[PDB]
Structure 1
Amino acid sequence: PVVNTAYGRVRGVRRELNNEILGPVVQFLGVPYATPPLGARRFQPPEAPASWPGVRQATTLPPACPQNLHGALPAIMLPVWFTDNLEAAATYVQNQSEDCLYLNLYVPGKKPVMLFLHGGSYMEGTGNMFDGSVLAAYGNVIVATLNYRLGVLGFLSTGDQAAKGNYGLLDQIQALRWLSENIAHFGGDPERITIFGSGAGASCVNLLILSHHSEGLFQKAIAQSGTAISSWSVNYQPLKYTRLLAAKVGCDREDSAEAVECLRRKPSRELVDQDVQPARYHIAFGPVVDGDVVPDDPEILMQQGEFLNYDMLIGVNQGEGLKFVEVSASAFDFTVSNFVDNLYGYPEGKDVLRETIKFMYTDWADRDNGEMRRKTLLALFTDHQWVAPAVATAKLHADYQSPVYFYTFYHHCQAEGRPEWADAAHGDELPYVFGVPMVGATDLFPCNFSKNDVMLSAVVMTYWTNFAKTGDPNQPVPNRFEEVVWSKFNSKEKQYLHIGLKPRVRDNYRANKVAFWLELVPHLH
C-alpha cells in the first residue's frame, strides 16, 4: 500500500473494521503536509513540506499539537463527551511535539474528499480521535483528519504585522492545498472536496468559507454546531491576552516584534502550560481579524455578501449548553445578570435587557419550580450561542443564492449521567457522523447503542456523504425516513430538517427567540 506524492512515497496500512458489512480500508496516518514550524517558522505561515527519497512509513498516528488538559478546561464550550471522558481523551494526546503538522487519510472513479476540522476550543483536541474509516467504508468517500496548531502556537496575534495570527487556519489552508494537488494520487477527486467540523472546527469551516486563500481548494462545507459570529468564534482582543501571556513568561517588551522575538525562544512546554484566563464566553487565543485570511468582521462579510457560493449544511442540537446549567430564582437572576454584562459589554440599559430576557425565557404557565428554570436556561444559552447564529448564517448565505441545508439534531446517545430523556447536548452528533454505533462503543464514547442508534447513524452518514458528492444531502443514495425531502433553506421559507427518531421538515425553528436576539435585543442598547 505504497503511494507516491509530489514530495515523497508513503507506506500505509490496511485494516478491517469491526463490522461484518463494512469491508477493509487503507489508512495513511501521519503524512506531512507542511514544513515543521519549529524555529523561525513558529508564529509564521505554513510552507510546503520537505521531500523524502525513500518510503516514509506512515502506519502510526502522528503526535498531537502541544496542549494542556491539566486544569482549567473550557467545559462550557467543549463537547460534552470530551469533558466527561477526559482520560479516554488524554490517551490520544500523550505524544505532543510542536512538529505536529501531519494528517491522516482513510480510503476505501475519482472518490470525493471529506476533511474533518476538529474543534473544541482552539487550544486542545486532535484529529486522531476520529477514526474516519467507518465513515469512509460506508460513504464511498475518503476521510481526512489533520492536526493544526493550537492555542498560543496557533493563534497568537498582536493586531500588528509582527504576528498577524490565524496560523492554525493557515495550516488548514495548507492541508487543503496539499490535498488539492496530492489526493489524485490516492484516486480521490480534488474537485469534490468537502470540509466538515463540529464546534470550534465548524467555526473554522465558516471562516474558510469567508476566506480568500481557500478559493480553489474546496467546494462544499458543513458546519455542525459551530458558527463564525458567536462570542467565542473570533478573538477581538489579541494584543491584550498576548501581552498577558508575554508578561507571564518574562516576555513583556513594548515592541511587538521583540516580544514575538523572545516568545520564539521559549520552549513550547512552558508556553502551553500557561493559562491566560479570557473573558466569560470569550477566548484568549483564537482566530482574529487579520485583514488577510479573514478580510474583515465575519458578520460584516456575510451582510455585505463578500464571499463565494459554497454549499453549506448548517445545523444545531436541541440542548447544547448542557454544561452551562450544571435552579433558584435568585440564581436565575444572577446568571442572567452575568450573561448580559459579559455578552453585551456591560451596557447602559442592562436592567431593561436583563428583565426582558428573564421574561422571554420564563414559561409563565408554571413559574414556581426550578426544573423549568433549568430548561429555560438551557434554552437560553442554546438559543443565543448556537441556534440564533446558525439561523443568521444560513439566512445571510442563502440570501445570496448559496444552497444551504439546515438540520436540528434531537435524538442523542445514552450514556452514564446522560439519560435518553435529556436533550442532545453539544457534540453528541459526532458519534452518528463517524459511524460509531456500527463498530461498537469506544472508550471515548461509552454509549448504550441500540438498533435505533445504528440506523440513525447510517441515515446521517448517508446525508453527509450525499452532500459531499452532489451538494444535495438526499440525492445519490436514499427505517423512519420515508420520502422525507430535505428541502432547501431560504429567508422566505426557512425550512429545516428535524433529524431524530421521528423526522419531519418544519418551516421556522424557534422563530420568536431567533427574531428576539437578532432583531430586538440590538436596539436595547
Structure 2
Amino acid sequence: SPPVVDTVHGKVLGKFVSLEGFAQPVAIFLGIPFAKPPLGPLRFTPPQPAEPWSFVKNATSYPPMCTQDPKAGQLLSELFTNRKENIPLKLSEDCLYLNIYTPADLTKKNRLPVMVWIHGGGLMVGAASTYDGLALAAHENVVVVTIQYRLGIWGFFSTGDEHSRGNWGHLDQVAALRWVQDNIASFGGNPGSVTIFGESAGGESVSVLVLSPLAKNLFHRAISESGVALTSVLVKKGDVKPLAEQIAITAGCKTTTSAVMVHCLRQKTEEELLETTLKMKFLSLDLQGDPRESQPLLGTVIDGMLLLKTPEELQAERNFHTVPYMVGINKQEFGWLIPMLMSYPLSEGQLDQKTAMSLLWKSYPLVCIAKELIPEATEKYLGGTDDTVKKKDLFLDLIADVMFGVPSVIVARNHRDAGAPTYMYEFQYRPSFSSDMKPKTVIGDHGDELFSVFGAPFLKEGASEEEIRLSKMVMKFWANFARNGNPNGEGLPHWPEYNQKEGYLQIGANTQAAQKLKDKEVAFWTNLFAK
C-alpha cells in the first residue's frame, strides 16, 4: 500500500516507484509544504512555518513553480530535466514546497545521508520538479530532497533597508533546511548528515548559505556546481535603492519612501508583478544606453541578516564554522546555453578585437569590467593568435573565466586556507541529451554535468556505455562526498584534495587528476581588478 509518513505538522501520503535493477521501491513525496504560503502581507517578508493539517495530506502531485516568466521557465526546465518527458508546471506565489525521494525501507529505522538540491535559473526562473531524484536515490542509497524558493521580485526585491531587506528566496532555502532538520528522520534520513548542492544560481545559493550564520548547523557538506558567491552577476553591491525605485515605478507605484514602495507593491496582483517583470526584461542583455545601469537579474544583497558583509570580506574571516566543500566548473561555461538564453549578440564565427571590446563593455552587468580596462582584458585573451575564429572561442573563455572560473578557484582557495576539506573539478563532456540546437563542438557547456549527477541515462532513453558509466561515476563521487565529506572510494579514479598543490579532478570520457586549475587566469584577473 501507499507510503504514509508522520511529520511534525501532520501525516503525508506518497507513492512507491520502482527503478529497473533495484528491489527496494523508492518512496516519493511531491509537494510537501515547508512554510506558510507567502501571500498578501507575507509577500516581501521572511518565511513563516507551515500550519499543521488534520488528516493525511496527499503528496502525489507536482507543486506549482514560483511565479516567473512562463516561457523562459518552461524552456529552461526542458533543457535541464533528467526525465524522459518534461513535466508542464503551473505558476503560483504558493510555491514553498519540497519533493522527497527516499530509498529507505520506511517500515524499519534508517539514517541515510540527505542531499538537498537547490536548482538554478538566475534566481529568476526554475523549479524543483524539473529534477527527478529517483536514480540518484536508488543508485546511491541517499535521501534526495529538491526544494523551491521565491524567485525574481518575489524573492529578491530589496529597498536596501529594514522595510524590505531582501534575500527572501535565500531565507526560504534556510527554512527548508530547518524543515529537513526537524522532519527528515521520518523519511529515513539522517538530520546529522545533510549535504546541500546546487548549480548556477543554485551553486551561488549554496555558496551564500556556506557564508551565512543563519544556516549554521543546518548542513554538513556543500557542493557548488558552476556558481559561487563571487559570481558578481548574482550579487548586488552598493546602493540597491535605485533599482527598487525603477521596479516600483514600472509597477506604477510612488517612490516617496521605502515603506511606501513596499506597501504599494504588496497591493499588486501576481499578474501585475509578472507584467512588471516582463517590462524590466530580465534575463536579457540590454544593448541600449549605459551597460553599467542594466540589471538583468534581481539577486543577493547584503541585507544584514543572511549576509553580514560582502562575500569577499566574509571569506577572509579565517575562523567561522567550516564544512567539507566541493566547488566545480564546466569546460565551456559560456559555450551556448547562457548566451542563448540571454539573447547575447554573437552570430559570427569570426570576431575582431574592436567588436570584442564593444561586446565586453555591453557585457558589463555580467563581467563588471570597467571601460578603461576592456582593452587589457581583450588583448590578454584575444591578442594570442591572429585567427579571428579562435578569437571568438577565446572571447567565450574570457566571459566564462570572469563569471565562473576565477570566482570558483578564489572561493576554493579561501575555503582551503580556512582549514576545511576542499575539492575541485572541471567537467568536460557533451551529453547526448543536449539540445538539438546546440553545436556538436560545444563540450562541457553550462549545466552539462547535471545529466550525470541526476542519472538521466537511467531515466531517459538512448545513451552510450560511456555516458552511462560517467553518470554512475559522478553519482558515486557525489554520494561518497555526502557520506564522508570525501568523494573517493574503491573503483573510482583518485580525486586529490584541493590543498596547496591545488590538485583537482578533470571529469569526462577520460577522468584524471590535474593541478593548478585556472592559475594564470586568477593572477591576471586579480591584478586587473586591483587597479
Compute the TM-score of the two structures, normalised by the length of structure 2. 0.88
The aligned residue for residue 498 of structure 2 is 489
Q: Counterparts in 2 of 1:149-164, with a 5 A limit? A: 149-164=150-165
For residues 139 and 405 of structure 1, what CA distance do their matches in structure 2 show? 20
The aligned residue for residue 306 of structure 2 is 293
Retained in 2: the 8 A contact 1:22–1:138?
A: no
The aligned residue for residue 444 of structure 1 is none
Counterpart of 2:16 in structure 1: which amino acid? R
The aligned residue for residue 266 of structure 1 is 268
Q: Name the SS for the 2:129 alignment partner.
A: helix
The aligned residue for residue 328 of structure 1 is 351
For residues 79 and 300 of structure 1, what CA distance do their matches in structure 2 show? 35
Q: How many percent of aligned residue pairs carry the same amino acid?
A: 36
Counterpart of 2:56 in structure 1: which amino acid? V
Counterpart of 1:272 in structure 2: which amino acid? L
The aligned residue for residue 370 of structure 1 is 388
Counterpart of 1:336 in structure 2: which amino acid? L
Residue segments in structure 2 that go unaligned for 5+ positions in a row: 104-109, 283-290, 340-345
The aligned residue for residue 94 of structure 2 is 99
Retained in 1: the 8 A contact 2:36–2:47?
A: yes
The aligned residue for residue 10 of structure 1 is 12
Query: Which string of whole-angstrom CA distances, capped at 9 and with x for unpartnered residues, describes residues 37-60 of structure 1?
Result: 112211111111111110000011
The aligned residue for residue 458 of structure 1 is 472
Give me the CA root mean square deviation.
2.4
Retained in 2: the 8 A contact 1:80–1:428?
A: no
For residues 117 and 392 of structure 1, what CA distance do their matches in structure 2 show? 22
Retained in 2: the 8 A contact 1:209–1:307?
A: no
For residues 417 and 371 of structure 1, what CA distance do their matches in structure 2 show? 20
* 1:23–1:412 CA distance, 2 compared to 1 (3 A): farther
For residues 165 and 125 of structure 1, what CA distance do their matches in structure 2 show? 19
The aligned residue for residue 455 of structure 2 is 435
The aligned residue for residue 241 of structure 1 is 243
Retained in 2: the 8 A contact 1:211–1:307?
A: no
Retained in 2: the 8 A contact 1:409–1:500?
A: yes
Retained in 2: the 8 A contact 1:203–1:223?
A: yes
Counterpart of 2:172 in structure 1: which amino acid? D
Question: What is the number of equivalent residue pairs in this alignment?
Answer: 496
Q: Name the SS for the 1:407 alignment partner.
A: strand
Q: Name the SS for the 1:454 alignment partner.
A: helix
* 1:496–1:69 CA distance, 2 compared to 1 (3 A): same
Q: How far is the alpha carbon of 1:21 from its aligned partner?
A: 4.9
Retained in 1: the 8 A contact 2:295–2:365?
A: no
* 1:241–1:277 CA distance, 2 compared to 1 (3 A): farther
* 1:260–1:270 CA distance, 2 compared to 1 (3 A): same
Q: How far is the alpha carbon of 1:419 from its aligned partner?
A: 4.8
For residues 97 and 411 of structure 1, what CA distance do their matches in structure 2 show? 36
The aligned residue for residue 29 of structure 1 is 30
Q: Counterparts in 2 of 1:104-143, with a 5 A limit? A: 104-108=99-103, 109-143=110-144
The aligned residue for residue 255 of structure 2 is 253
Q: Counterparts in 2 of 1:58-207, with a 5 A limit? A: 58-70=59-71, 81=79, 92-93=88-89, 95-108=90-103, 109-207=110-208
Retained in 1: the 8 A contact 2:143–2:188?
A: no
Q: How far is the alpha carbon of 1:422 from its aligned partner?
A: 2.6
Counterpart of 1:465 in structure 2: which amino acid? A
Shifted more, 240-249 versus 287-296: the winner is: 240-249
Shifted more, 411-420 versus 193-202: the winner is: 411-420
Retained in 1: the 8 A contact 2:30–2:99?
A: yes
Query: Which string of whole-angstrom CA distances, capped at 9 and with x for unpartnered residues, describes residues 211-244 of structure 1?
Result: 1111121110100001101121212353222211
Residue segments in structure 1 that go unaligned for 5+ positions in a row: 442-447
For residues 422 and 78 of structure 2, what CA distance do their matches in structure 1 show? 27
For residues 248 and 117 of structure 1, what CA distance do their matches in structure 2 show? 30
Q: Name the SS for the 1:182 alignment partner.
A: helix
Q: How far is the alpha carbon of 1:151 from its aligned partner?
A: 0.6
Q: Counterparts in 2 of 1:277-292, with a 5 A limit? A: 277=281, 282-292=295-305
For residues 98 and 420 of structure 1, what CA distance do their matches in structure 2 show? 39
1:410 equivalent among 393, 408, 428 = 428
For residues 52 and 305 of structure 1, what CA distance do their matches in structure 2 show? 45
Retained in 1: the 8 A contact 2:232–2:366?
A: no
Query: Which string of whole-angstrom CA distances, capped at 9 and with x for unpartnered residues, describes residues 462-518 of structure 1?
Result: 00000000000013x54xx5xx3211112x211101111112111112321221112
* 1:457–1:468 CA distance, 2 compared to 1 (3 A): same
1:521 equivalent among 502, 524, 528 = 528
Q: Name the SS for the 2:328 alignment partner.
A: strand
* 1:37–1:192 CA distance, 2 compared to 1 (3 A): same
For residues 393 and 145 of structure 2, what CA distance do their matches in structure 1 show? 37
Counterpart of 1:485 in structure 2: which amino acid? H
Retained in 2: the 8 A contact 1:80–1:425?
A: no
Q: Name the SS for the 2:193 alignment partner.
A: strand
For residues 257 and 42 of structure 1, what CA distance do their matches in structure 2 show? 13
For residues 302 and 374 of structure 1, what CA distance do their matches in structure 2 show? 34
